[PDB]
Amino acid sequence: TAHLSVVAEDGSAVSATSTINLYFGSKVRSPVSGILFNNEMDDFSSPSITNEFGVPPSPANFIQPGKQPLSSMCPTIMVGQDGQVRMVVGAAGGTQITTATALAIIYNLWFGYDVKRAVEEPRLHNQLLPNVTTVERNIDQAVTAALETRHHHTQIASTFIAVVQAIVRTAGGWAAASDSRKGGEPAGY
Amino acid sequence: DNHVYTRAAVAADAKQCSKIGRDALRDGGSAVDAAIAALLCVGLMNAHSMGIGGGLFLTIYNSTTRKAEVINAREVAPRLAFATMFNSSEQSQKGGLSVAVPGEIRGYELAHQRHGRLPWARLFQPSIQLARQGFPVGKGLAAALENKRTVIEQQPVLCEVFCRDRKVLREGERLTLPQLADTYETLAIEGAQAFYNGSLTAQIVKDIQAAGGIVTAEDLNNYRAELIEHPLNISLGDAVLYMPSAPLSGPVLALILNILKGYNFSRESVESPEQKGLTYHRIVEAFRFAYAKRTLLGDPKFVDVTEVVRNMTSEFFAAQLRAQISDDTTHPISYYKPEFYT
Numbered sequence: 127t128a129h130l131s132v133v134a135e136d137g138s139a140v141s142a143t144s145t146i147n148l149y150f151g152s153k154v155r156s157p158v159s160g161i162l163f164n165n166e167m168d169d170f171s172s173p174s175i176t177n178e179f180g181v182p183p184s185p186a187n188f189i190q191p192g193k194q195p196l197s198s199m200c201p202t203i204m205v206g207q208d209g210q211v212r213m214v215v216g217a218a219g220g221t222q223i224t225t226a227t228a229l230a231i232i233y234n235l236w237f238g239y240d241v242k243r244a245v246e247e248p249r250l251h252n253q254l255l256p257n258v259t260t261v262e263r264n265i266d267q268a269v270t271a272a273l274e275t276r277h278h279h280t281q282i283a284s285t286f287i288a289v290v291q292a293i294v295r296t297a298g299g300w301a302a303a304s305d306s307r308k309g310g311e312p313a314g315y
Numbered sequence: 316d317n318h319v320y321t322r323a324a325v326a327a328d329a330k331q332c333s334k335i336g337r338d339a340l341r342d343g344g345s346a347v348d349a350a351i352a353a354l355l356c357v358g359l360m361n362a363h364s365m366g367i368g369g370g371l372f373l374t375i376y377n378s379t380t381r382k383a384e385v386i387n388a389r390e391v392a393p394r395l396a397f398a399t400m401f402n403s404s405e406q407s408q409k410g411g412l413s414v415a416v417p418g419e420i421r422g423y424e425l426a427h428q429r430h431g432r433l434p435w436a437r438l439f440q441p442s443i444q445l446a447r448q449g450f451p452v453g454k455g456l457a458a459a460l461e462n463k464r465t466v467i468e469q470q471p472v473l474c475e476v477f478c479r480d481r482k483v484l485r486e487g488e489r490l491t492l493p494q495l496a497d498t499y500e501t502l503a504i505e506g507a508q509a510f511y512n513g514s515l516t517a518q519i520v521k522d523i524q525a526a527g528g529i530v531t532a533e534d535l536n537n538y539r540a541e542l543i544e545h546p547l548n549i550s551l552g553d554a555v556l557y558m559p560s561a562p563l564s565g566p567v568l569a570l571i572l573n574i575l576k577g578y579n580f581s582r583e584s585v586e587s588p589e590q591k592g593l594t595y596h597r598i599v600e601a602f603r604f605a606y607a608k609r610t611l612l613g614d615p616k617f618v619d620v621t622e623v624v625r626n627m628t629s630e631f632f633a634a635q636l637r638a639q640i641s642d643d644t645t646h647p648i649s650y651y652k653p654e655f656y657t
């Protein structure tokens with residue numbers, strides 16, 4: 127998955143999230159065209175596959191011909207009451223996409239973190255099943271303590287949680303940030 | 316340098332692709348032109364993540380009409396697919412049978428028909444060069460190559476481009492994508508039809524089937540990107556948030572944020588350890604309540620999600636869930652009432 131955010135000079139905007147699903151998709155590359163094919167069929171639920179311990183299938187997300195599989199993707203554009211874009215945001219990184227997108231919005235909109243900080247700020251994730259709270263390596267450990275004393279079992283993500291690209295309107299114009307977890311950098315004028 | 320820009324901005328996950336997007340804007344492109352040009356480049360530099368073999372969604376806001384739209388160009392199950400076609404995760408994750416019908420290029424075409432200002436071919440030009448000339452492998456791709464070292468090294472058609480002397484490329488080493496360069500060139504000149512009903516089509520079907528897949532020419536001919544004029548929105552303060560409904564996770568996002576909005580988070584919510592710890596606790600619980608309802612979601616053309624989605628975007632419902640969040644404890648799974656049937 128990759129997320130990209132754009133704001134043009136006229137104030138129009140695009141939030142685009144694209145994916146071939148797992149790393150290198152199906153692992154099928156065409157020797158002639160070079161196209162690397164998705165494994166998006168894996169995003170369906172299957173009745174005979176035991177996905178996770180104690181997690182049943184979701185019948186709403188079973189394979190039918192012509193059906194699109196459920197996705198965690200959520201490319202978002204926030205617009206102010208005056209019609210001007212306020213934030214362009216989304217994420218990559220599997221089931222953590224939605225939680226990470228929520229966190230980036232919370233961080234900027236409510237906690238007052240500037241866009242770069244909103245992107246770089248440590249994240250955490252819980253998706254109910256499985257039943258564990260994952261936190262990034264550099265999270266404020268007072269947060270970890272607050273969670274554990276409230277009976278969350280936490281564990282630390284061996285790499286990182288998601289990748290966020292974002293743009294936010296400021297008095298100085300359009301502030302952009304790409305996530306250092308993957309190494310991107312924005313550009314503009 | 317600082318990444319605050321007076322006029323326009325592109326935030327991609329590779330520097331050169333953000334730049335390519337930015338140049339398109341400079342040369343008179345719309346935000347859509349820039350997004351397509353940048354996406355084409357990301358498909359090269361982060362080929363593990365996305366590309367013309369996959370699918371996407373675009374949320375687009377027009378500053379003039381003050382309207383938002385969504386373009387759905389996500390992959391679909393092929394016409395020969397069925398509910399019980401897979402019996403292990405390995406079957407659904409590897410090989411041609413794991414492949415759904417790619418929508419990427421029809422999505423770029425629809426967006427471009429609606430919002431493009433630059434010529435189609437111009438959007439591909441810088442990525443054709445890049446693929447043909449080569450580029451140093453970035454951090455993100457390098458870690459992805461390391462992660463799948465084994466499968467890549469043992470697969471000669473992937474190692475062809477993703478190795479140097481039989482071993483996966485590392486950060487700094489040169490990656491060239493000479494076949495994709497030709498493919499991008501054909502796309503630029505013959506348009507989207509080359510992929511779906513044109514000079515690339517039969518080779519696509521052949522590659523997918525040779526690897527055990529079931530995609531046919533008919534699937535490609537029939538794929539359509541979909542314009543959604545009324546995306547999901549929620550109201551947050553004086554703002555509106557536009558995001559895609561099912562089969563994407565806008566409704567999950569909506570529910571998380573509507574749960575949390577009744578706590579009136581501010582700078583104070585994170586100023587002391589006491590407030591901060593409680594705040595992050597409340598976030599996790601909102602995540603759990605929202606993921607509970609997620610298991611009822613699916614493609615709305617195949618499954619009736621009208622009321623589920625209605626609830627997931629309702630502030631009242633979110634308030635009902637917030638009132639069940641205990642400030643002193645998390646709860647067992649059943650507490651959140653995950654549902655697998657209506």
Ligand SMILES: *[C@@H]1O[C@H](CO)[C@@H](O)[C@H](O)[C@H]1NC(C)=O
Pocket residue numbers: 399400401402406
């Ligand atoms: C899985 O089992 C079903 C039912 O026997 C069968 O139709 C299908 O072809 C099998 N698929 C694979 C990939 O083994």
Ligand SMILES: *[C@@H]1O[C@H](CO)[C@@H](O)[C@H](O)[C@H]1NC(C)=O
Pocket residue numbers: 138345346377378379380429430431
């Ligand atoms: C917004 O729509 C109007 C008319 O519908 C059009 O003139 C304008 O170019 C559009 N903006 C973009 C960025 O497509």
Ligand SMILES: *[C@@H]1O[C@H](CO)[C@@H](O)[C@H](O)[C@H]1NC(C)=O
Pocket residue numbers: 511512513514516517532536
């Ligand atoms: C292209 O178009 C039509 C159906 O749209 C079909 O008859 C024809 O065989 C297709 N050709 C290819 C190469 O897919």
Ligand SMILES: *[C@@H]1O[C@H](CO)[C@@H](O)[C@H](O)[C@H]1NC(C)=O
Pocket residue numbers: 545547548549555
């Ligand atoms: C939000 O969506 C609802 C239902 O489709 C509708 O009341 C309204 O027009 C939307 N709001 C905006 C600002 O587009």
Ligand SMILES: *[C@@H]1O[C@H](CO)[C@@H](O)[C@H](O)[C@H]1NC(C)=O
Pocket residue numbers: 622623626632635657
């Ligand atoms: C929606 O929410 C209400 C509670 O506010 C509940 O009675 C109803 O069952 C829910 N509907 C669906 C379709 O889940």
Ligand SMILES: *[C@@H]1O[C@H](CO)[C@@H](O)[C@H](O)[C@H]1NC(C)=O
Pocket residue numbers: 257258277278279645646647648649
């Ligand atoms: C889930 O984690 C919570 C943490 O307290 C615990 O209460 C519960 O027993 C765990 N297991 C289930 C099945 O909910």
Ligand SMILES: N[C@@H](CCC(=O)O)C(=O)O
Pocket residue numbers: 127145146147148149166169196197198199218219220221
């Ligand atoms: N294919 C998944 C995302 C996979 C990933 O980011 O690793 C989705 O659309 O939700």
Ligand SMILES: [Cl-]
Pocket residue numbers: 127128129130217218289290291308328
């Ligand atoms: Cl990304």
Ligand SMILES: [Cl-]
Pocket residue numbers: 159160476491492493494495496
């Ligand atoms: Cl190639």
Ligand code: NA
Pocket residue numbers: 242302303304312317318
């Ligand atoms: Na930045």
